[PDB]
């Protein structure tokens, strides 16, 4: 799954005050889904149906 740093470069995602990263296109904070062999944070737009990896 794409990586949320190459995202956040790109212009697709933004981190916000909680260090929450969220679809800046949205603006709204995507639905963190269960992670049980991925040992970080996975934020998934489904408005825009797109899947990035957040490393917390």
Same mark, same amino acid.
Request: with cysteine; hydrophobic share 20%; glycine share 8%.
């Given at each position: 799954?794409? +990586? +949320?740093?190459?995202?956040?470069?790109?212009?697709? &995602?933004?981190?916000?005050?909680?260090?929450? &990263? +969220?679809?800046?296109?949205?603006?709204?904070?995507?639905?963190?889904?269960?992670?049980?062999?991925?040992?970080?944070?996975?934020?998934?737009?489904?408005?825009?149906?797109?899947?990035?990896?957040? &490393?917390?």
């Amino acid at each position: 799954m794409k +990586t +949320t740093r190459k995202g956040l470069r790109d212009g697709e &995602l933004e981190k916000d005050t909680y260090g929450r &990263l +969220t679809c800046s296109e949205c603006g709204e904070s995507l639905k963190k889904k269960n992670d049980p062999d991925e040992v970080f944070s996975v934020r998934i737009c489904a408005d825009c149906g797109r899947e990035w990896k957040e &490393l917390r």
